[PDB]
Each structure stands twice: as structure tokens, then as C-alpha cells.
Structure 1
Amino acid sequence: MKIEEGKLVIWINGDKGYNGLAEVGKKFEKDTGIKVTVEHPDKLEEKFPQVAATGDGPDIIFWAHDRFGGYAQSGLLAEITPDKAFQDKLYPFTWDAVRYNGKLIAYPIAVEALSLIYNKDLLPNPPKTWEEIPALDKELKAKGKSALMFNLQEPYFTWPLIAADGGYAFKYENGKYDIKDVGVDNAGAKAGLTFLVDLIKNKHMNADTDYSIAEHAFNHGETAMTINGPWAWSNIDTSKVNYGVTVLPTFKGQPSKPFVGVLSAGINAASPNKELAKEFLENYLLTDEGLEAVNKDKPLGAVALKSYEEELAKDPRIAATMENAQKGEIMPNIPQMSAFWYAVRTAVINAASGRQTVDAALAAAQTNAAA
């Protein structure tokens, strides 16, 4: 299983508009004769570094920009070469997210942030605070509904609450991240995680809730709210739930702070098709018609391409996404991010079960993240 010259294989996560991307691929193939294959492997963010290290894997890998620093450090990504005219077509802050050691290591596609999604038929006025959700849940629970269900298995989803009162990954300083200053066991993080664990131990939420269960619950009107990204909107559209996308609730009077991801496309350093990959990404995908094809499948969020974003920006769901993004922080792209996510994922799982105390769980995560 190697990489053939003269074809493109693209990996993208299963929650994104891979069929729409495949349509852009088929258009490229029709115009050029170059076959484009789109796959969505499980755990692609882990599989890529394993297969790319041996010189194999996809020609193009899509993921949020946070994983890309580590890929690039491991020599798995090729420096990309858009010209000044091309770079001008995307927002500068999107290029920042994909710059690593003064080198662009991927094409930015779209800016993603979690929002609060609520059922307007159940909940005309969404809660402004996390604090009021317990009582709302009790009130709803007959009705026979619940207030809030979202993916508790991945720290991406729980982090906005953890960060609200002060939790953080790595301290941003002299333009760089102090990788020895990790903010996962400070009082803010502890306050956030404690509230979350309390909701679970009091059966306002279930520790086993994952993406699939929460999506089912919201999309069939069993729960009044969920937390998710723009990729989720099209299934809600199909469900016919009358939904709103809004600012996340506050905690201790402060904004929830989602970690902002820029979906990005990197080129496998081991690919003999670097020129083709550049041509596809710049002149097929990163175009109004190309982004529209993907977006129509699953919404991308706020696209990096100025010309198309100017249209999407009029959508109140996009406005809410960017409001939530502004209240959160851009993810760092440093290689240490992988250890951070792993550390936080374990801490949340362990605390939610009652296995470890919040304090003990976060103490452990702090140590793991920082070494």
C-alpha cells in the first residue's frame, strides 16, 4: 500500500462534507483525467502519522490545524507554496493557524467553533447561563424531555466550560506558547470540570453520552439543547427541528470559550503528487463553487475564502459561530497539543465516572500535558 504518481487520495473526517468534496474531486478528474479518491478513515488523526511516517498514506490530509504542527515537526507535511495573489484571497488569521516555524504547512479551509443549538419549540428563550440548566432540566423532565445533551466523550466539547473560569492549555506569551505553563489544574479548570461532573452525578447528563446519542436526542426532539459545530446543521435541517444557533452559556458570569479550529488541508511530504495537490486545492477546492459543493453537503463554518465567506457571513448561524469563536481561543498548533488533548480526555472521563476526583484527575492531566 503505497502512493501512486498521477492520482490523488484525500482523507477527511467522517463528520465533514466528504461527499461534496468527492464531487469537487470528480470535477477535477473530468477536467484533467486525474483520479481523486476521498476516504474518511476512523481515527484518521492517529492513522495519518502512523502511515505517513513509513512514506505511505493520503496525498492530502484534512483536519483542524491543531494536529498539523506535530505532523510538520515529524517531517510528514510538505511546505506549501501559494503565491501572494492566492494568499490574499484568504483571511490573514487563517494563514496564521497553518504557519509553523515561519512556514505554511497547510491550506486553511474554514473556521470552526462550537455553539449552543436549541430547539425553539421547546425552549423559545435559551438559557444564558450554565447555572440555570440544572433547574431547566428538572422542569423539562416531564414534558419527559431533558435540557441538554452533547458529546461528553471528546474534550473538544467539554473544554469551553472548563476554560470559562480560567482553564487553559498553554500560556500565550512572547508570541509563542510557554509549553511548561499548562492551565488544566488551576482553580478555573477545577471549577469548570466540577460543575460538569456535578451535572453528571446528579443525572442531568449521562456520562456515556457521545456524539451519536446527543445528535439522535436533539434531532428527534428528546432534548432541548445540544452543543455542536456547523457540520452538524444539515442533519438538523433534515430532522425539521425548529432550531436556533446561539452564544454558549456563561459560567461564573464569564463566556464559555470554545477552542477554535481551522479545518485545513495538508500535503503528505511523501506524496509524488505535490503539484497536483496544490492545483486541486488552490484552483478547484478553494473557489466559490468548490467550497459551495462541500458546504452544501455539511456546512463548513466561516470559510477562509474571502469571496465565499462574504455570502455565508449573512447567515445568523455563522454570526453566532463567529461570536462564539471570538469568545474562545484559536487552538495552538504546537506538537504538544496532542499530549494536551489526550491528558484532558482522560481527566474528564475519569472524573465523570467518579473513578478519580476532579482534583486528582486534573492534577494527573496537568503532569501529562506538560511532559
Structure 2
Amino acid sequence: NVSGSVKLWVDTTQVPYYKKIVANFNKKYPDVKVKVTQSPNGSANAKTDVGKDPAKAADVFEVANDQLGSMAEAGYINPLSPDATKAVKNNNVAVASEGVTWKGKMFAYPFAEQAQTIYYNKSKLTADDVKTWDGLTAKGVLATDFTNAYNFYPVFLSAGTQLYGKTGETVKGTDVNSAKGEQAMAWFAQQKSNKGVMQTSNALNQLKSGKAAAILDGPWNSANIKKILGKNFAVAPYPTIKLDGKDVQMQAFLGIETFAVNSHASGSNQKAAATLASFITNKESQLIVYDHSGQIPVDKTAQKSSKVASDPVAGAVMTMAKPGNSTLMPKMPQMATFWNDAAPLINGAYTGSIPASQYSTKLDTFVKNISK
């Protein structure tokens, strides 16, 4: 039998359907008392929401896979048991297991596959128009945010550099301090004068108001964008960009969204928390998430279900996940420093605060900063 009390943190607009999932959980586990709330600052900030006071934080919380190495090394999350590991590994696609594994051990329960795509108004742009960045932006406005390194760091990967080495596990393996890194910096700088590229802190609002024909966004907004665009909804994988005069696919990050168990819990509450985390990331629960938000399951069977297989967003995400089209976010503890330093590097190139004469110096300093 499973008993105990568990606090669950989810992202703000997810609460209504996690309440439905928790109702399903309580059919099987009637004696577990779950309190579902939004988190203080969302899954993109889980490591600090938990770290500021682990005993006060939720017992089960939503967290993106890049944060897991930091949280594991800090002792905020424990390895999954052998049986829990086997379930994750057997039920979900390979990259989901890679996403939650740190030094050979799993530290979270994966449930969704996240890659950004182009979302666009098909009354304004065609499927052919969105194949290239310059071609798209010559025909309509793309709204985006150059202060967000999750949006734009992958251009360095398109340029042929590595982030923490071949597989994201090599502390000294970022090699962006090179001519290839400079090519990415120059691409950011070019976009400042591209009249079809609109800098904004709220790209989705620009799509809603009609000021943008296209945005880059992820599947957490799939159902949201389908509602906004209605019969004009369309989606595509990322386009090619020109780097050093060559067309290359513009990458996104591949992220795995997860739930983790707070290591503070003990006794019955710990068992209840692990049971909840397993349940809310099971196939049925992943399909409920899909039905509400459009997020893409990592469960092998769910991905091949008719409804997911016919969804154009799922198809675009599956394309994005292929080698060359994205890179799995690394989960090194150093990712904290990476994210902090990457945003001003990219935005400085875009705004011109970093001129071309300084690209090499700034990239050298960046690599030193993130490679300790």
C-alpha cells in the first residue's frame, strides 16, 4: 500500500489538467493526499525555486533536463531506483532517458519532448517561404527575443561548434572560441538590420495582434497557438540560415521536460512522491497532457498513437529531434554559468554592443568562464 502527503508543483496553466491526472492517480492510490499548485517561478526556474529552501519546496516538481546535473550534485534529487530506471528506459524514447541520466544514473521522470519550431500564419506565408530564414523574413515579420539564449545559442551549433563536447559531458569541450563561433556572432549582428526580424519580449503577443507573421516557439504553446491562429495555423521545422555564405540548418535545443522528487521527503511521503512522479509521467498521463497543451509525449507507444502521429506539431518536433536539426541540452552543473553568460554574448552581438572587432576576445572569455 502507498500512503502519505505530497505537494506537486507544475507550471501555471498546467494546474487544471494535472488535477485531472491526480484524480486518476487517486483512483489507484486512494490514500495519498496530493496538493497541486503552480510553482513559484516555473519549470525553467526549478533549481532555484527548490534550492532556496528544499524543505519548503514541493515533493514533486516540474524541471527541465538541463538543470538536473546541478541539482544532483547539490543533493536536491536522488537517483531513481533500479526498478524505476527500468520503467523509464523501457517505456520512453532513447533521448528521454539520455536527458535524465547524469553520470550513468537517472535523476528524474521524463514526460515531454521539447523542440522549438516555426509557428506561422499561413495566410501570410507559405510552406515554401518558411524553408529559409532570409526568404521568410523578406516576406513577413518574424518576432523573437535575442536576449534569450535558449532561442539563439544553437546557431553556434549550426556554425559547427560543440557545447561541452561531443555528447555534452566534457567540461572543457566547448570550442566556440573559433572562426566558426565568429560566424555565428556575425549572423546575430546581421539580424539587427533585417526589417523582417522584430525584437520583442513577448513574441506570442505579436503573433496574436497580427504584427508578426511567424514566431519561434515550443510545444508548451502548441494548443495555445492553434487557438490563436485558428484555420490559419501552420508549423514547420526550423529553416536554413546562411553562415559563412553556406546554407545550414538552424538548430534548436532539444529539451526533455521532467518531474523530479525532492530528496527532503522521507518515509511514507518519499514513497508516495516517487509513486506520484511515476504515475503523472506514465503513458495515460502524457496523453492527457498532449490533449490539453499539445506537448509531445516521450512514451514510445504514445508517440505512435494516431492522434499524435497526425499532429503537424509532433511531426515538426520529430524532425527537429534528428541529428543536425537540434542538440540535447547538456546538464553539466556548469550550465548555470553557461546560461548566464550566453545571453549577453548573443544579445551583445545582435545589438552591436559587442562589435566584430571584439568577437574573438569575447568568445575566448566565454569559454573560460563556462569551462571551470
TM > 0.5 between the two?
yes
Distance 1:85 1:133, change over 3 A: closer
Deviation at 1:331, TM superposition (A): 1.5
Distance 1:33 1:11, change over 3 A: closer
Partners of 2:46 and 2:282 in 1: CA distance: 26
Aligned residue number for residue 189 of structure 2: 197
Distance 1:335 1:134, change over 3 A: same
Aligned residue number for residue 333 of structure 2: 335
1:116 and 2:118 correspond: yes
C-alpha distance after superposition, 1:307-344 (max 9, x if no partner) = 22211133222111111121211122221222111111
**Structure 2 residue matching 1:251: 3-state secondary structure:** strand
Contact residue 62 and residue 264 of structure 1 kept, 8 A: yes
Partners of 2:87 and 2:136 in 1: CA distance: 49
Contact residue 65 and residue 100 of structure 2 kept, 8 A: yes
**Which one of the candidate residues 239, 243, 249 is aligned to 2:233?**
243
Contact residue 184 and residue 366 of structure 1 kept, 8 A: yes
C-alpha distance after superposition, 1:256-287 (max 9, x if no partner) = 1211101011111112322112212223x233
Specify the code of the residue in structure 1 equivalent to 2:125: L
**Which one of the candidate residues 226, 233, 258 is aligned to 2:222?**
233
Aligned residue number for residue 35 of structure 1: 34
Partners of 1:148 and 1:29 in 2: CA distance: 45
Contact residue 8 and residue 58 of structure 2 kept, 8 A: yes
Question: Comparing 285-294 with 303-312, which one deviates more in the overlay?
Answer: 285-294
Contact residue 62 and residue 258 of structure 2 kept, 8 A: yes
**Which one of the candidate residues 16, 19, 27 is aligned to 1:19?**
16
Contact residue 337 and residue 369 of structure 2 kept, 8 A: yes
- Compute the RMSD of aligned alpha carbons: 2.4
Aligned length: 349
Deviation at 1:85, TM superposition (A): 5.1
Deviation at 1:204, TM superposition (A): 4.0
**Which one of the candidate residues 119, 129, 149 is aligned to 1:126?**
129
Specify the code of the residue in structure 1 equivalent to 2:116: L
Partners of 1:250 and 1:156 in 2: CA distance: 18
Contact residue 17 and residue 231 of structure 1 kept, 8 A: no
1:265 and 2:259 correspond: yes
Distance 1:13 1:345, change over 3 A: farther
Contact residue 8 and residue 36 of structure 1 kept, 8 A: yes
Partners of 1:215 and 1:93 in 2: CA distance: 28
1:309 and 2:303 correspond: yes
Specify the code of the residue in structure 1 equivalent to 2:164: F
Partners of 1:357 and 1:26 in 2: CA distance: 56
**Which one of the candidate residues 160, 174, 177 is aligned to 2:169?**
177
Contact residue 160 and residue 259 of structure 1 kept, 8 A: yes
**Structure 1 residue matching 2:129: 3-state secondary structure:** coil
Partners of 2:88 and 2:63 in 1: CA distance: 21
Deviation at 1:291, TM superposition (A): 1.8
The runs of 5 or more residues in structure 2 that have no matched partner are: none
Aligned residue number for residue 218 of structure 1: 207
**Structure 1 residue matching 2:52: 3-state secondary structure:** helix
Specify the code of the residue in structure 1 equivalent to 2:67: R
Specify the code of the residue in structure 1 equivalent to 2:270: K
Deviation at 1:230, TM superposition (A): 0.9
**Structure 2 residue matching 1:68: 3-state secondary structure:** helix
TM-score by length of structure 2 reads: 0.85
Deviation at 1:23, TM superposition (A): 2.4
Aligned residue number for residue 367 of structure 1: 368
Contact residue 113 and residue 254 of structure 2 kept, 8 A: yes
**Structure 2 residue matching 1:180: 3-state secondary structure:** coil
Contact residue 261 and residue 330 of structure 1 kept, 8 A: yes
TM-score by length of structure 1 reads: 0.85
Deviation at 1:92, TM superposition (A): 3.0
Identity of paired residues, percent?
A: 22
Specify the code of the residue in structure 2 equivalent to 1:64: A
